[PDB]
Amino acid sequence: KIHPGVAMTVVRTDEILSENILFSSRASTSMFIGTPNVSRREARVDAVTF
Amino acid sequence: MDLKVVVSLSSRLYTDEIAKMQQRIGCILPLASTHGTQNVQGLGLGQVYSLETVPDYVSMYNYLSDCTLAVLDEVSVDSLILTKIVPGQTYAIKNKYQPFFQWHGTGSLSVMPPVFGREHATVKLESNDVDIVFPMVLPTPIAEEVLQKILLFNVYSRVVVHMHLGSVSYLGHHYELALPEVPGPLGLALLDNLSLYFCIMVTLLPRASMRLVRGLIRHEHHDLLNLFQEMVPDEIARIDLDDLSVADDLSRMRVMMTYLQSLASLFNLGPRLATAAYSQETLTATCWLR
Amino acid sequence: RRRLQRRIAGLLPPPARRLNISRGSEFTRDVRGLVEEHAQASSLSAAAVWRAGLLAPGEVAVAWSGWRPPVFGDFLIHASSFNNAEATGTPLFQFKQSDPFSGVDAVFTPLSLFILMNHGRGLTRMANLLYDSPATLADLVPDFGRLVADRRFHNFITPVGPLVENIKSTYLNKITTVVHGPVVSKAIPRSTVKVTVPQEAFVDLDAWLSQPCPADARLYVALTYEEAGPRFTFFQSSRGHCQIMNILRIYYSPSIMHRYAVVQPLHIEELTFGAVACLGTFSATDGWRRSAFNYRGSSLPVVEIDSFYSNVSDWEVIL
């Protein structure tokens, strides 16, 4: 427990779970909504996956 | 059945990267998942083949057999679409690969990690800061020649004849391929299993066929016999001193043909494509997964 | 050439791969025409037959879609050689009998396949509880000791896929099994069928290693040759056959040197460390939900692979 001939500066990172607040102004972004088209992916032998 | 995987890029895409990707339309690309939409990470062979100096081809094979396969048909800015290759469907796969291997009529295609360089089959995407590389698709005999040339350079590395091994030769052109130095534990494990197979071959191999070829070299000269240079090997001399017996030979061949099928399946790494009716004027082939 | 347009109108339109829905609440007739698959069983009237469309050639069409109809293997077995308390979805194994004309075949569940390995030397409690006497099974294989001794037991047993129909006859049982295709039960209330493999004989190989998740995770059955008699293990993997023989050699790496150390292979035929065979594919996500199989007395753990596509293959030797 003697001191060595050198020192150290211990850096670490600490994660903090926050509860954010998002503001956004009116008419900031114009967006086009598409069409919800349905499909068939896989005809597995007992269940078909849409 | 609907096979359409749209891959949304998380950023934009410049016109040079668009024009480079648009030349590679119809080339086979692997995917991470099999779902509807995907992000750009996991696409291509680039996640296992990093931008380094050291490759590892057998790990890319273990990736390629694990992941699915898709064909690149539409590329746009911010999103490019792919068409999956599920077994049971029949696809039109165009020959849009720059080292031009001419395809056989109703032969068999075979996907492949990029043996002719990283920079050769790739697109640099600085915009999404990743790299999409394209797996090579070449016919199955030339694929076997490339695979055995890689393994032969892996075993001859502690010996040295280089350019006689480090360059594939096809009737269209002969091509150089990238030669690494060590495949790590996976290529050595493949060589381990093939060493088991080869050593058990030289256990159970018959002796009457050596007695055939020893007199046959002394009898006949052939292109199957010119590589011995009219010198029977000494192992033929020190094995053919015994007699010949047909019962132990039929006992030996019943394990020889039993093991050679599994040795044939020790070269089926990477998924295989069974093709049909390849037209040499449109460079596309009606092909499906085998 | 105007009848040609009528023929091509009868031939053109595939089932819709895409359909623009607006809401799910309306449930239009177009999306019903998308989601409907023609059945396989209907009542015995002209209206029900014409409505289900069984009489359409090749595939069902009322008066191609990526679906393949299954094929059924029809097997006649002795009522003693099989247990009628078996589950439906259990994979069986026809043994090629050595007579020129038989009529009656010989199939084996992996429970029944266990007691051919046990005698001469949990799971075994349930196995001996189901079949009382091994000697009524150990004569179906006439020369079991020689065939195990010269390591030719893999080429005489071929897999057959899971069972679907088992009529409860008294002397000569007829069972139906799906040797290829979508495994689905032939019951008048069409209910699903789960391939059941007992738990101690089914060791996973994905979690045995412990990112690209594929869809079709195959199921490999594996005969190996041990000094304690041969063993029938089952392996689930999401990889290729090229991958599966390498990783199964790595998995059996202690057992090969075990069999070598206790017994020197004095002849040339004892080198083969059995073989493997792909039994078919299933979905890698909801695969292998664990369940239980209850007899009257006891209960063993058993895996339940659901929605299996049976596809057997030839034997690839392990060494």
XYZ file of C-alpha atoms in Angstrom:
659
model
C 0.000 0.000 0.000
C 2.825 2.429 -0.668
C 2.483 5.010 -3.379
C 4.126 4.116 -6.700
C 6.159 6.610 -8.645
C 3.237 7.629 -10.844
C -0.426 8.614 -10.675
C -3.512 7.782 -12.683
C -6.639 9.676 -13.711
C -9.469 7.161 -13.749
C -11.921 7.991 -16.527
C -15.233 6.140 -16.683
C -18.615 6.486 -18.350
C -21.923 6.483 -16.511
C -25.193 5.730 -18.274
C -28.248 7.713 -17.168
C -31.756 6.687 -18.185
C -33.530 9.975 -18.841
C -37.132 10.916 -19.663
C -36.880 13.181 -22.672
C -39.239 15.874 -23.943
C -39.579 16.283 -27.700
C -40.999 19.523 -29.040
C -41.790 20.063 -32.706
C -43.327 23.101 -34.377
C -46.472 23.111 -36.493
C -46.140 22.092 -40.168
C -42.438 21.368 -39.847
C -42.577 18.387 -42.190
C -44.825 17.503 -45.103
C -45.247 13.767 -45.546
C -47.019 11.541 -48.034
C -48.793 8.468 -46.684
C -48.678 5.511 -49.051
C -51.036 2.599 -49.437
C -51.073 -0.409 -47.100
C -50.696 -3.224 -49.618
C -50.880 -6.815 -48.360
C -48.702 -9.646 -49.667
C -47.838 -13.324 -49.174
C -44.293 -14.129 -48.113
C -44.034 -17.831 -47.393
C -46.337 -20.809 -47.823
C -44.969 -22.781 -44.914
C -46.565 -26.198 -44.681
C -49.137 -25.341 -42.015
C -49.213 -21.539 -41.842
C -48.952 -18.905 -44.532
C -47.236 -15.701 -43.410
C -48.754 -12.533 -44.801
C -45.853 -15.941 -53.600
C -44.343 -12.467 -53.230
C -40.542 -12.268 -52.972
C -39.600 -8.601 -52.745
C -37.207 -7.255 -50.113
C -36.816 -3.479 -50.103
C -33.672 -2.339 -48.302
C -33.979 1.249 -47.132
C -30.658 3.043 -46.900
C -30.450 5.134 -43.752
C -28.904 8.005 -45.725
C -28.852 9.352 -49.279
C -26.697 8.186 -52.185
C -24.614 10.180 -54.637
C -24.863 9.837 -58.403
C -21.532 8.037 -58.842
C -22.448 5.344 -56.318
C -25.852 5.096 -58.022
C -24.205 4.666 -61.429
C -21.794 2.094 -60.003
C -24.577 0.083 -58.364
C -26.748 0.327 -61.487
C -24.150 -1.619 -63.450
C -24.529 -4.451 -60.917
C -28.207 -5.191 -61.509
C -28.952 -8.897 -61.702
C -25.949 -9.959 -59.631
C -26.531 -12.233 -56.659
C -26.433 -10.619 -53.235
C -26.822 -12.226 -49.808
C -29.038 -10.851 -47.071
C -29.110 -10.889 -43.297
C -32.722 -11.909 -42.674
C -35.552 -13.122 -44.912
C -38.122 -10.540 -43.803
C -39.915 -7.761 -45.670
C -37.708 -4.709 -45.179
C -34.113 -4.614 -43.976
C -31.442 -2.075 -43.159
C -28.208 -1.918 -45.106
C -26.014 -3.544 -42.477
C -25.953 -7.281 -42.987
C -26.436 -6.860 -46.727
C -23.701 -8.269 -48.918
C -20.655 -10.245 -47.913
C -19.033 -7.180 -46.351
C -19.842 -7.845 -42.697
C -17.655 -10.957 -42.655
C -15.186 -9.574 -45.231
C -14.017 -6.399 -43.543
C -11.818 -3.738 -45.151
C -8.595 -5.399 -44.040
C -5.588 -7.090 -45.586
C -6.352 -10.588 -44.275
C -9.180 -12.581 -45.894
C -10.717 -15.865 -44.800
C -12.623 -17.654 -47.529
C -14.101 -20.568 -45.587
C -15.716 -18.197 -43.085
C -17.359 -16.444 -46.025
C -18.567 -19.866 -47.164
C -19.978 -20.545 -43.690
C -21.687 -17.171 -43.939
C -23.054 -17.896 -47.424
C -24.546 -21.261 -46.512
C -26.063 -19.674 -43.412
C -27.596 -16.608 -45.013
C -30.151 -16.419 -47.797
C -29.586 -15.295 -51.377
C -31.181 -12.548 -53.437
C -30.865 -10.889 -56.837
C -30.477 -7.134 -57.316
C -33.126 -5.720 -59.645
C -34.035 -2.146 -58.652
C -31.698 0.363 -57.044
C -32.849 3.905 -56.308
C -31.645 6.709 -54.100
C -32.260 6.085 -50.353
C -33.643 2.581 -51.051
C -32.796 -0.422 -53.205
C -35.018 -3.449 -53.740
C -34.059 -7.117 -53.874
C -35.767 -10.334 -54.945
C -35.172 -13.333 -52.684
C -34.144 -16.774 -53.911
C -36.195 -19.357 -52.015
C -36.001 -23.037 -53.063
C -39.006 -24.057 -55.129
C -39.138 -21.040 -57.445
C -37.455 -20.570 -60.807
C -35.449 -17.434 -61.522
C -33.767 -15.619 -64.388
C -30.183 -14.917 -63.329
C -28.219 -12.718 -65.705
C -24.467 -13.038 -66.186
C -23.368 -9.592 -65.039
C -20.040 -10.607 -63.514
C -16.917 -8.796 -64.700
C -14.447 -11.759 -64.776
C -16.349 -13.281 -67.648
C -16.773 -17.006 -67.172
C -18.759 -18.424 -70.076
C -21.649 -20.499 -68.791
C -22.454 -24.057 -69.833
C -25.704 -25.090 -71.441
C -27.828 -26.464 -68.540
C -24.766 -26.800 -66.323
C -24.648 -25.823 -62.657
C -23.849 -22.439 -61.157
C -22.116 -21.947 -57.832
C -21.823 -18.899 -55.617
C -18.475 -17.906 -54.252
C -16.646 -15.479 -51.986
C -14.804 -12.811 -54.001
C -11.636 -14.527 -55.135
C -10.588 -11.872 -57.666
C -10.161 -9.092 -55.128
C -12.080 -6.859 -52.768
C -11.896 -3.768 -54.986
C -12.963 -5.726 -58.069
C -16.459 -6.777 -56.928
C -17.622 -4.036 -54.570
C -19.410 -0.724 -54.306
C -18.044 1.948 -51.978
C -20.894 3.548 -50.031
C -19.422 6.460 -48.104
C -22.916 7.917 -47.676
C -24.048 5.064 -45.430
C -20.344 4.520 -44.451
C -20.527 0.774 -45.182
C -19.370 -1.440 -48.047
C -21.454 -3.792 -50.163
C -19.382 -6.447 -51.884
C -20.742 -8.893 -54.401
C -20.225 -12.665 -54.190
C -18.847 -14.231 -57.342
C -21.119 -16.565 -59.311
C -19.154 -18.924 -61.550
C -19.883 -22.400 -62.947
C -19.267 -25.424 -60.770
C -16.137 -26.979 -62.450
C -14.272 -23.667 -62.437
C -15.481 -23.208 -58.849
C -13.952 -26.563 -57.922
C -10.735 -25.515 -59.673
C -10.649 -22.261 -57.687
C -11.387 -24.057 -54.403
C -8.700 -26.675 -54.946
C -6.228 -23.980 -56.031
C -6.893 -22.157 -52.757
C -6.404 -25.354 -50.738
C -3.272 -26.237 -52.714
C -1.786 -22.834 -51.955
C -2.787 -23.388 -48.333
C -0.838 -26.646 -48.135
C 2.164 -25.594 -50.261
C 2.761 -22.474 -48.133
C 5.417 -24.129 -45.972
C 7.250 -25.523 -49.018
C 8.264 -22.727 -51.401
C 5.491 -22.742 -58.850
C 3.470 -19.847 -57.462
C 2.026 -18.509 -60.722
C 1.447 -22.100 -61.845
C -0.939 -22.334 -58.873
C -2.019 -18.765 -58.140
C -3.787 -18.190 -61.463
C -6.912 -19.889 -62.773
C -7.060 -20.703 -66.491
C -10.285 -20.641 -68.504
C -10.889 -20.795 -72.252
C -12.211 -17.233 -72.228
C -9.155 -15.898 -70.356
C -6.811 -16.974 -67.593
C -7.249 -14.964 -64.399
C -5.196 -14.191 -61.320
C -6.825 -14.612 -57.916
C -6.007 -13.228 -54.486
C -3.892 -15.605 -52.414
C -4.015 -15.194 -48.618
C -1.434 -16.661 -46.260
C -3.413 -18.419 -43.492
C -7.128 -19.282 -43.227
C -6.992 -19.442 -39.451
C -8.626 -22.366 -37.652
C -11.509 -22.835 -40.104
C -9.523 -23.511 -43.286
C -7.233 -25.682 -41.211
C -10.294 -27.526 -39.874
C -11.436 -28.102 -43.458
C -7.929 -29.369 -44.244
C -8.149 -31.478 -41.072
C -11.318 -33.219 -42.257
C -9.848 -33.628 -45.733
C -6.684 -35.014 -44.103
C -8.792 -37.576 -42.245
C -10.388 -38.469 -45.555
C -7.075 -38.712 -47.437
C -5.338 -40.741 -44.731
C -8.236 -43.160 -44.495
C -8.089 -43.368 -48.310
C -4.464 -44.467 -48.146
C -5.452 -46.982 -45.505
C -8.265 -48.691 -47.363
C -7.133 -48.259 -50.974
C -6.990 -51.480 -53.032
C -3.786 -53.025 -54.304
C -4.866 -54.665 -57.569
C -5.318 -51.272 -59.206
C -1.731 -50.422 -58.311
C -0.751 -53.748 -59.876
C -2.687 -52.635 -62.951
C -1.026 -49.242 -63.219
C 2.505 -50.518 -62.486
C 2.459 -52.861 -65.448
C 0.365 -50.355 -67.381
C 2.983 -47.617 -67.094
C 5.403 -50.281 -68.309
C 2.863 -51.254 -71.002
C 1.107 -48.080 -72.139
C 1.768 -44.349 -72.249
C -1.176 -41.994 -71.840
C -2.076 -38.461 -70.824
C -3.266 -40.100 -67.609
C 0.244 -41.575 -67.298
C 2.585 -38.857 -68.600
C 2.719 -37.096 -65.224
C 4.587 -40.049 -63.700
C 7.316 -39.392 -66.328
C 7.558 -43.163 -67.021
C 8.721 -43.731 -63.440
C 6.505 -45.945 -61.298
C 6.496 -44.525 -57.754
C 8.340 -46.455 -55.077
C 5.164 -46.966 -53.030
C 3.748 -48.981 -55.935
C 6.876 -51.142 -55.731
C 6.703 -51.612 -51.957
C 2.951 -52.292 -51.936
C 2.617 -54.440 -55.094
C 5.014 -57.041 -53.632
C 1.971 -58.670 -52.029
C -0.434 -60.893 -53.940
C -3.871 -60.101 -55.363
C -7.181 -61.173 -53.826
C -10.628 -60.252 -55.095
C -12.538 -60.730 -51.822
C -10.561 -58.156 -49.852
C -10.723 -55.881 -52.902
C -14.518 -56.011 -52.912
C -14.387 -55.407 -49.178
C -12.153 -52.379 -49.784
C -14.286 -50.905 -52.561
C -17.411 -51.124 -50.396
C -15.779 -48.562 -48.110
C -14.089 -46.632 -50.948
C -17.345 -45.724 -52.688
C -18.932 -45.201 -49.274
C -16.366 -42.544 -48.380
C -16.081 -40.879 -51.781
C -19.686 -39.629 -51.647
C -18.974 -37.858 -48.364
C -15.713 -36.574 -49.842
C -17.765 -35.165 -52.717
C -19.978 -33.477 -50.162
C -16.824 -32.043 -48.563
C -16.666 -29.678 -51.572
C -20.323 -28.565 -51.568
C -19.601 -25.569 -49.334
C -21.429 -22.519 -50.547
C -24.927 -22.959 -51.968
C -25.260 -24.382 -55.453
C -27.463 -23.186 -58.311
C -28.915 -25.582 -60.887
C -29.309 -23.778 -64.203
C -31.048 -24.491 -67.499
C -31.236 -22.998 -71.010
C -28.552 -20.336 -70.785
C -28.682 -18.141 -73.886
C -25.311 -16.765 -74.955
C -26.957 -13.785 -76.686
C -28.857 -12.319 -73.711
C -26.470 -13.602 -70.978
C -29.327 -14.782 -68.748
C -30.223 -18.265 -67.583
C -33.436 -19.776 -66.253
C -32.009 -21.111 -63.011
C -33.261 -22.382 -59.664
C -31.703 -23.319 -56.359
C -30.288 -26.791 -55.804
C -57.880 -17.074 -82.830
C -60.815 -15.707 -80.861
C -61.119 -18.975 -78.960
C -57.411 -18.464 -78.246
C -58.295 -15.353 -76.247
C -60.823 -17.366 -74.238
C -58.247 -20.093 -73.569
C -55.646 -17.543 -72.510
C -58.250 -15.812 -70.327
C -58.757 -19.165 -68.662
C -54.978 -19.540 -68.374
C -53.521 -16.085 -67.550
C -54.336 -14.682 -64.112
C -52.174 -15.932 -61.257
C -53.304 -15.483 -57.654
C -52.703 -11.931 -56.507
C -49.294 -11.403 -54.935
C -50.177 -7.858 -53.851
C -53.489 -6.233 -52.975
C -54.116 -2.635 -51.925
C -56.230 -2.879 -48.793
C -57.804 0.229 -47.284
C -59.020 -1.068 -43.909
C -59.008 -4.476 -42.283
C -62.534 -3.930 -40.997
C -64.246 -4.009 -44.400
C -62.832 -7.429 -45.474
C -63.433 -7.051 -49.201
C -64.075 -9.960 -51.539
C -60.758 -9.254 -53.299
C -58.655 -9.860 -50.196
C -60.830 -12.898 -49.448
C -59.989 -14.186 -52.923
C -56.355 -13.580 -52.041
C -56.305 -15.266 -48.631
C -58.433 -18.290 -49.521
C -56.733 -21.597 -50.273
C -58.846 -24.397 -51.736
C -59.381 -27.291 -49.354
C -58.624 -30.990 -49.692
C -61.650 -32.666 -48.077
C -65.358 -32.101 -48.597
C -68.642 -33.929 -48.238
C -69.770 -36.444 -50.832
C -72.165 -34.360 -52.891
C -71.878 -32.701 -56.286
C -72.111 -29.234 -54.732
C -69.382 -29.844 -52.151
C -67.072 -31.505 -54.685
C -67.567 -28.695 -57.200
C -67.174 -26.063 -54.473
C -63.950 -27.473 -53.043
C -62.724 -28.019 -56.601
C -61.106 -31.410 -56.104
C -61.622 -32.497 -59.711
C -59.367 -29.789 -61.154
C -56.298 -31.224 -62.920
C -52.921 -30.987 -61.236
C -53.936 -28.489 -58.569
C -57.245 -27.493 -57.024
C -59.336 -24.832 -58.788
C -63.060 -24.115 -58.449
C -65.401 -24.050 -61.450
C -48.967 -23.783 -59.179
C -49.425 -21.409 -56.232
C -46.133 -22.426 -54.607
C -47.823 -25.250 -52.675
C -46.901 -28.843 -53.194
C -49.317 -31.637 -52.256
C -47.756 -34.327 -50.069
C -47.142 -37.940 -50.974
C -48.066 -40.727 -48.603
C -46.085 -43.879 -47.897
C -48.316 -46.856 -47.166
C -46.775 -49.433 -44.848
C -48.030 -52.760 -43.518
C -46.547 -53.802 -40.175
C -47.216 -56.433 -37.554
C -49.426 -55.212 -34.724
C -46.913 -56.452 -32.156
C -43.978 -54.593 -33.730
C -45.682 -51.213 -33.283
C -47.300 -49.530 -30.303
C -50.725 -48.057 -31.025
C -50.239 -45.601 -28.149
C -47.693 -43.694 -30.235
C -48.202 -40.057 -31.095
C -49.151 -39.030 -34.611
C -46.149 -36.990 -35.637
C -43.272 -39.304 -34.916
C -40.559 -40.074 -37.473
C -40.266 -43.729 -38.369
C -37.588 -45.897 -39.948
C -38.299 -48.680 -42.402
C -35.737 -51.462 -42.205
C -35.049 -53.144 -45.537
C -35.893 -56.784 -44.919
C -33.639 -59.404 -46.502
C -36.330 -61.608 -47.990
C -37.088 -61.319 -51.732
C -40.856 -61.006 -51.255
C -42.203 -59.797 -47.920
C -45.580 -58.086 -48.136
C -45.145 -56.922 -44.537
C -42.495 -54.271 -43.938
C -40.832 -53.331 -40.644
C -40.881 -49.796 -39.260
C -39.366 -48.406 -36.074
C -40.115 -45.418 -33.907
C -37.014 -44.019 -32.158
C -38.506 -45.357 -28.943
C -38.662 -48.786 -30.579
C -35.306 -48.145 -32.228
C -33.834 -47.630 -28.758
C -34.588 -51.140 -27.511
C -32.737 -52.733 -30.397
C -29.667 -50.917 -29.090
C -30.344 -51.457 -25.389
C -30.558 -55.231 -25.141
C -27.248 -56.949 -25.185
C -26.283 -54.283 -22.638
C -36.234 -41.584 -18.232
C -36.103 -42.487 -21.908
C -35.252 -46.151 -21.357
C -37.947 -46.539 -18.690
C -40.628 -45.301 -21.086
C -39.123 -47.395 -23.889
C -39.256 -50.600 -21.852
C -42.712 -49.599 -20.608
C -44.105 -49.270 -24.134
C -42.659 -52.414 -25.715
C -42.453 -55.213 -23.176
C -40.257 -57.687 -25.053
C -37.270 -56.727 -27.227
C -37.127 -60.209 -28.746
C -40.304 -59.553 -30.722
C -38.431 -56.604 -32.242
C -34.928 -58.087 -32.417
C -36.076 -60.719 -34.926
C -37.354 -58.123 -37.396
C -33.710 -57.437 -37.982
C -32.678 -61.081 -38.462
C -28.913 -60.640 -37.989
C -28.552 -57.498 -35.908
C -25.224 -58.413 -34.343
C -23.444 -59.098 -37.624
C -24.934 -56.014 -39.292
C -23.809 -53.797 -36.430
C -20.472 -55.626 -36.357
C -19.509 -54.922 -39.972
C -20.938 -51.365 -39.725
C -23.592 -51.821 -42.412
C -26.582 -50.740 -40.355
C -26.935 -47.291 -41.900
C -27.494 -48.470 -45.467
C -30.160 -50.987 -44.441
C -32.337 -48.497 -42.544
C -33.801 -45.678 -44.558
C -35.855 -42.902 -42.957
C -39.472 -42.526 -43.975
C -40.681 -39.303 -42.364
C -43.348 -38.820 -39.723
C -46.537 -40.784 -39.283
C -49.975 -39.355 -40.040
C -52.522 -42.194 -40.037
C -52.473 -45.289 -37.831
C -55.531 -47.518 -38.008
C -55.912 -49.719 -34.941
C -56.052 -53.135 -36.550
C -55.560 -56.338 -34.575
C -52.928 -58.374 -36.459
C -51.429 -56.484 -39.411
C -51.286 -52.734 -38.913
C -51.380 -50.316 -41.827
C -49.769 -46.963 -41.128
C -49.489 -43.997 -43.449
C -46.447 -41.759 -43.504
C -45.363 -38.680 -45.432
C -42.102 -39.505 -47.185
C -41.918 -36.111 -48.911
C -43.714 -32.814 -48.854
C -45.812 -30.753 -46.446
C -46.658 -32.892 -43.428
C -50.355 -32.370 -42.719
C -52.812 -34.777 -41.141
C -55.528 -36.551 -43.109
C -58.337 -36.093 -40.605
C -61.858 -34.898 -41.394
C -61.445 -32.073 -38.904
C -58.136 -31.049 -40.433
C -55.888 -30.597 -37.412
C -52.180 -29.902 -37.434
C -49.514 -32.478 -36.658
C -46.260 -31.921 -34.767
C -43.155 -34.017 -35.360
C -42.208 -35.478 -31.975
C -38.665 -36.624 -31.198
C -37.802 -37.732 -27.624
C -35.752 -35.175 -25.769
C -32.695 -37.178 -24.695
C -32.259 -38.375 -28.279
C -32.656 -34.829 -29.647
C -29.684 -32.608 -28.867
C -29.744 -29.131 -30.371
C -26.747 -27.954 -32.362
C -27.389 -24.225 -32.683
C -27.413 -23.753 -28.908
C -24.620 -26.307 -28.487
C -22.217 -23.712 -29.871
C -23.859 -20.932 -27.767
C -26.242 -13.458 -36.521
C -27.743 -14.233 -40.024
C -30.916 -16.081 -39.070
C -32.231 -18.154 -41.995
C -35.731 -19.518 -42.423
C -35.328 -23.253 -43.061
C -33.604 -24.958 -40.135
C -33.119 -28.591 -41.071
C -33.484 -31.622 -38.811
C -30.735 -34.228 -39.082
C -31.010 -37.791 -37.829
C -27.673 -39.401 -37.046
C -26.803 -43.047 -36.613
C -23.457 -43.534 -34.916
C -21.596 -46.707 -34.006
C -20.611 -47.005 -30.359
C -18.957 -49.663 -28.253
C -22.122 -49.539 -26.130
C -24.174 -50.387 -29.219
C -25.274 -47.929 -31.902
C -27.155 -44.750 -31.114
C -29.838 -42.775 -32.938
C -29.462 -39.071 -32.213
C -31.339 -36.150 -33.739
C -29.779 -32.802 -34.641
C -31.455 -29.508 -35.444
C -29.341 -27.057 -37.376
C -29.797 -23.910 -39.427
C -26.834 -24.591 -41.711
C -25.829 -26.497 -44.818
C -24.966 -30.148 -45.320
C -21.367 -29.092 -45.935
C -21.535 -27.389 -42.551
C -23.372 -30.243 -40.900
C -20.811 -32.976 -41.511
C -17.970 -30.737 -40.305
C -19.775 -29.665 -37.149
C -21.005 -33.209 -36.511
C -17.454 -34.533 -36.780
C -16.501 -31.834 -34.264
C -19.441 -32.850 -32.054
C -18.491 -36.536 -32.174
C -14.737 -35.827 -31.692
C -14.633 -37.425 -28.193
C -16.718 -40.416 -29.226
C -14.525 -41.479 -32.163
C -11.408 -41.663 -30.010
C -13.502 -43.365 -27.326
C -14.510 -46.146 -29.728
C -10.953 -46.267 -31.062
C -9.374 -46.499 -27.612
C -11.596 -49.258 -26.288
C -11.562 -51.328 -29.522
C -8.871 -51.326 -32.181
C -10.474 -51.480 -35.655
C -8.717 -54.728 -36.523
C -10.445 -55.029 -39.912
C -11.208 -52.547 -42.674
C -14.979 -52.198 -42.217
C -15.006 -50.836 -38.656
C -13.773 -47.392 -39.693
C -17.183 -45.871 -40.489
C -18.540 -43.843 -37.572
C -22.082 -44.105 -38.856
C -23.887 -41.633 -41.058
C -26.346 -38.749 -41.069
C -29.372 -37.862 -43.167
C -31.417 -34.694 -43.591
C -35.013 -35.368 -42.588
C -36.324 -32.092 -44.005
C -36.779 -28.441 -43.190
C -38.843 -26.348 -40.807
C -39.061 -22.746 -39.669
C -36.100 -21.571 -37.603
C -38.166 -19.190 -35.456
C -40.925 -21.270 -33.839
C -39.047 -24.534 -34.098
C -38.851 -27.255 -31.473
C -41.281 -26.204 -28.761
C -40.782 -28.553 -25.816
C -43.701 -30.698 -24.670
C -44.398 -34.023 -22.963
C -45.621 -37.471 -24.006
C -47.739 -39.296 -21.444
C -48.264 -43.026 -21.423
C -50.620 -44.591 -18.868
C -47.832 -44.935 -16.320
C -45.047 -42.442 -16.924
C -44.148 -39.406 -18.999
C -40.934 -38.490 -20.761
C -39.888 -35.139 -22.219
C -40.204 -34.935 -25.992
C -39.531 -32.133 -28.426
C -42.367 -31.013 -30.707
C -41.220 -29.639 -34.031
C -44.231 -27.940 -35.569
C -44.991 -27.512 -39.299
C -42.376 -29.897 -40.630
C -41.645 -30.279 -44.342
C -40.394 -33.847 -44.583
C -37.638 -34.439 -47.136
C -35.394 -37.445 -46.614
C -31.924 -37.796 -48.091
C -29.341 -40.506 -48.565
C -26.835 -41.390 -45.864
C -23.722 -39.217 -45.644
C -21.067 -41.010 -43.589
C -19.439 -39.244 -40.666
C -16.022 -40.925 -40.130
